[PDB]
RNA sequence: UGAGAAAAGCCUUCUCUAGCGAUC
């Protein structure tokens, strides 16, 4: 930078909110950073894009008895 | 919990089908709205047959 | 035998706009457990971007335009020629209020383009809907007024009086008199943080949280009198102009400026940045208009010498730049597709009754607001306003119930002051220095007589 | 022999626990035991996974829970270490992804099958020495039996709304769940989420 | 109690219920 001076001091208050550890199963911090980039709210995505992003993993009917698996539905 | 209910009225007999319901907590302050509110009641109950007199 | 078998394609440029991954990174991964997560992340990103590409057809409006014929220059085209050639709806938006008995006026548009508030030097304060010709309030504080700004919705407005800072309702009822902020010259509001920034004559920059009502920061610039101030909407940082020729970047967390950029050989008197946060426009006493690239380079992209001095600068949502020199305003236009505005030749010109004291573009309309000694004028600027607005963020045609639902959502979503940095995505990157501190703790737990000498 | 359990999948199999700190697998059709594995301490109760035929969880007295694959019984799949007293009873959800354990200390915990730490813990002054816990059949409630002559009912999720929901309520609930797992590694999120008063 | 007290006409901000909407 020809005439620009950049403050090299770190913002400690902002650094408190950042993630300290590198989560499993990630070896490099570049790998973990990629997953968090995509936003998920309905403000930034269409309604059908929002629905596929918020798909629940387990769906249960409220009143039906759940039986164990039986030979791939026999 | 899918089952059929037979309701007898002065006008005739009605057969209805129940899709789903929270059975254990039904007699509780929050879940009771499921049957009280007409819109929520239509969600879980349908009229499959009606035979008037 | 189907001539075109494949599904409908989507434009690559449009998809690239709805993209937030860094493909340039060449990280190596040799583990399948790492690989499965990465491919899903790309799969999630690609499908969301495709859906937004199809939604481009849902957009219904088109930006305005103005091009001459038979070699005529658009600079010499006057406002009267435009008004007769445009529909009756837009023609009603051009008007010239004449209030010379009071001093020169400073004007501010609300974030929604429906409402306008202005303040006079002699102390005339009025707020009005400007689309319809109705007056919300019109009061005369006995003390002098230097600046006027809106606070989030149109309900609250802040005036920078001679002694202290005052807060008023949209109907003219005085609410707060803030004595900490004294001799304030300039006011400007950060919308998504609910912070109001004040520049004072004594040289102090103060941040006030309007949501809670407490002062979060008070910083001493140590640069003398402060009179030139602006914010970057993308960056949320505050720009300060000084007589040295340097512009300082400020955040509420730090007690020292983020960066200093030398831009002029003399004192700087104006600064403005675009909505995207890419380009920076400054003017100075050396009669030079400069455009800087804020995306890591900080070099002057364009330079032009001016006969008079550009007191004020502003940027629209489509990238048009207007400079106010004395009693004459000049607008420079460029294609704007990944390019700065072209300073080769201006787009439109207009002469005011008096010297210019304030400029701002209406958010979602093709009009320009000018405040001067004679009064307030509204120009017609075809192609300056962004056509398609979002109904859930800033709806001009919103009811009272819609407005109050939005305000709670914004209050639930307020950003803390300390998160402001030069990078709005700084929260995403892993704290590298905190990594190695953790790794250190992890490691911790895991010839014959020469012998007689 | 303390307990015996039939396997809900391939229903001819059996599991057993005895007083020599061993677990014995039987076979009803061929009328012979299959294999024996000895641990450090006695296992109080055994429970079969209702969605995985070859997986079972043993409640052991060394403050721990052991998840086993019966084909490869040399080493346990996972170890659960959040209890501080002898574990008495366990039971699986029919979804097969979680189980609830009773212990000698006056608390009950819920563990994910793939995690080694408990998701939540329930406690009360009036409840002492939980003897038995059974997970209800619709994956929504917890019932526990204690020695103070009372049986208590608990909720599977402490913040779910049981009644019929509208479209906006369901959309909001799904958005909240995806938000929590997206930002699960941030320190402030971890600080609030993992705090259980004891 | 002490922007005294009392009465009329206009805007601003907001509170309660009651139907109605969730059945594809």
Curated annotation (Swiss-Prot), chain A:
Report what the Swiss-Prot or TrEMBL entry states about this protein's PTMs.
Citrullinated by PADI4.
**Taxonomic superkingdom:** Eukaryota
Give the sites of the cross-link named Glycyl lysine isopeptide (Lys-Gly) (interchain with G-Cter in SUMO2): 70
Tell me where it resides.
Nucleus, Nucleolus
Which tissues is this protein detected in according to the database?
A: Ubiquitously expressed.
Extra remark beyond the main annotation: The human genome also contains the UTP14C gene, an autosomal retrotransposed copy of this X-linked gene. Evolution of autosomal retrogenes from X-linked progenitors compensates for X-chromosome silencing during male meiosis.
**Family affiliation:** Belongs to the UTP14 family.
**Which proteins does it associate with, and in what oligomeric form?**
Interacts with DHX37.
The protein's job, in short, is: May be required for ribosome biogenesis.
Q: What is the recorded name of this protein? A: U3 small nucleolar RNA-associated protein 14 homolog A
Q: Which organism is it from?
A: Homo sapiens
Name of the gene encoding the protein in the UniProt record:
UTP14A
- Report where the shown chain sits in the full-length sequence: first residue, last residue, total length: 664 to 737 of 771
From Swiss-Prot, chain B:
Protein name as annotated:
Nucleolar protein 56
**What is the disulfide pattern of this chain?**
none
Q: Where in the cell is it found?
A: Nucleus, Nucleolus; Cytoplasm; Nucleus, Nucleoplasm
Disease named in the record: Spinocerebellar ataxia 36: A form of spinocerebellar ataxia, a clinically and genetically heterogeneous group of cerebellar disorders. Patients show progressive incoordination of gait and often poor coordination of hands, speech and eye movements, due to degeneration of the cerebellum with variable involvement of the brainstem and spinal cord. SCA36 is characterized by complicated clinical features, with ataxia as the first symptom, followed by characteristic late-onset involvement of the motor neuron system.
- What is the stated purpose of this protein? Involved in the early to middle stages of 60S ribosomal subunit biogenesis. Required for the biogenesis of box C/D snoRNAs such U3, U8 and U14 snoRNAs. Part of the small subunit (SSU) processome, first precursor of the small eukaryotic ribosomal subunit. During the assembly of the SSU processome in the nucleolus, many ribosome biogenesis factors, an RNA chaperone and ribosomal proteins associate with the nascent pre-rRNA and work in concert to generate RNA folding, modifications, rearrangements and cleavage as well as targeted degradation of pre-ribosomal RNA by the RNA exosome.
Q: Which family does it belong to?
A: Belongs to the NOP5/NOP56 family.
Q: Which organism is it from?
A: Homo sapiens (Human)
Q: Which domain of life is it from?
A: Eukaryota
Curated annotation (Swiss-Prot), chain C:
Q: Where is this protein found?
A: Nucleus, Nucleolus
Record's keyword terms, sorted: Nucleus, Phosphoprotein, Repeat, WD repeat
A GO molecular function for this record?
A: RNA binding
GO CC annotation terms, alphabetical:
nucleolus; nucleoplasm; small-subunit processome
Report the superkingdom from the record. Answer: Eukaryota
Positions of disulphide bridges: none
The segments carrying the WD repeats are: 99-140, 141-178, 180-218, 221-260, 263-302, 305-342
One GO term of the biological process aspect: ribosomal small subunit biogenesis
What is the recorded function of this protein according to its Swiss-Prot or TrEMBL entry? Scaffold component of the nucleolar structure. Required for localization of DDX21 and NCL to the granular compartment of the nucleolus. Part of the small subunit (SSU) processome, first precursor of the small eukaryotic ribosomal subunit. During the assembly of the SSU processome in the nucleolus, many ribosome biogenesis factors, an RNA chaperone and ribosomal proteins associate with the nascent pre-rRNA and work in concert to generate RNA folding, modifications, rearrangements and cleavage as well as targeted degradation of pre-ribosomal RNA by the RNA exosome.
The annotated subunit structure for this chain is: Part of the small subunit (SSU) processome, composed of more than 70 proteins and the RNA chaperone small nucleolar RNA (snoRNA) U3. Interacts with DDX21, NCL, NOP2 and EBNA1BP2.
Q: What is this protein called?
A: WD repeat-containing protein 46
Q: Which organism is it from?
A: Homo sapiens (Human)
Swiss-Prot record, chain D:
- Some GO term, biological process aspect, for this entry: which one? protein ubiquitination
Q: Which family does it belong to?
A: Belongs to the WD repeat DCAF13/WDSOF1 family.
Q: Where in the cell is it found?
A: Nucleus, Nucleolus
Parent sequence residues shown: 199 to 396 of 445
Q: What does this protein do?
A: Part of the small subunit (SSU) processome, first precursor of the small eukaryotic ribosomal subunit. During the assembly of the SSU processome in the nucleolus, many ribosome biogenesis factors, an RNA chaperone and ribosomal proteins associate with the nascent pre-rRNA and work in concert to generate RNA folding, modifications, rearrangements and cleavage as well as targeted degradation of pre-ribosomal RNA by the RNA exosome. Participates in the 18S rRNA processing in growing oocytes, being essential for oocyte nonsurrounded nucleolus (NSN) to surrounded nucleolus (SN) transition. Substrate-recognition component of a DCX (DDB1-CUL4-X-box) E3 ubiquitin-protein ligase complex that plays a key role in embryo preimplantation and is required for normal meiotic cycle progression in oocytes. Acts as a maternal factor that regulates oocyte and zygotic chromatin tightness during maternal to zygotic transition. Also involved in the transformation of the endometrium into the decidua, known as decidualization, providing a solid foundation for implantation of blastocysts.
Q: What is its main location?
A: nucleus
Q: Does the keyword Ribonucleoprotein apply?
A: yes
Q: Report a single Gene Ontology molecular function.
A: nuclear estrogen receptor binding
Q: Which cysteines are joined by disulfide bonds?
A: none
